[PDB]
C-alpha cells in the first residue's frame, strides 16, 4: 500500500521484530521492510535542482 518513488539502498538500521517502516522528525518515510526478504532498506529522494 505504501507508494512513492526514490532510490533504494542498504542501511545499518536495526528495526524491531514488529516494525514495518520508519519516519523522521518531519514525518517522511525513509525506510521500509521487505515482506519476503526482511531486509533493511532506506529510501532517498531522486536528484533535482
Amino acid at each position: 500500500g505504501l507508494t512513492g518513488t526514490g532510490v533504494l539502498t542498504k542501511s545499518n538500521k536495526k528495526f524491531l521484530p514488529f516494525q514495518q517502516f520508519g519516519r523522521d522528525i518531519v514525518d517522511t518515510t525513509d525506510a521500509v521492510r521487505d515482506p519476503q526478504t526482511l531486509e533493511i532498506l532506506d529510501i532517498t529522494p531522486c536528484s533535482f535542482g
Binding site: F18, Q19, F21, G22, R23
Partner: peptide
C-alpha cells in the same frame, strides 16, 4: 458450587508509571 475465596481490598498505590505501550509501528 460458588468458591468465592477472594475479597476486595479497594487498596491502591501512587508509584506505578507502568501503563505505557506502543501505539503504532513507526
Amino acid at each position: 458450587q460458588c468458591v468465592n475465596l477472594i475479597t476486595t481490598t479497594q487498596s491502591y498505590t501512587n508509584s506505578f508509571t507502568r501503563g505505557v505501550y506502543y501505539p503504532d509501528k513507526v
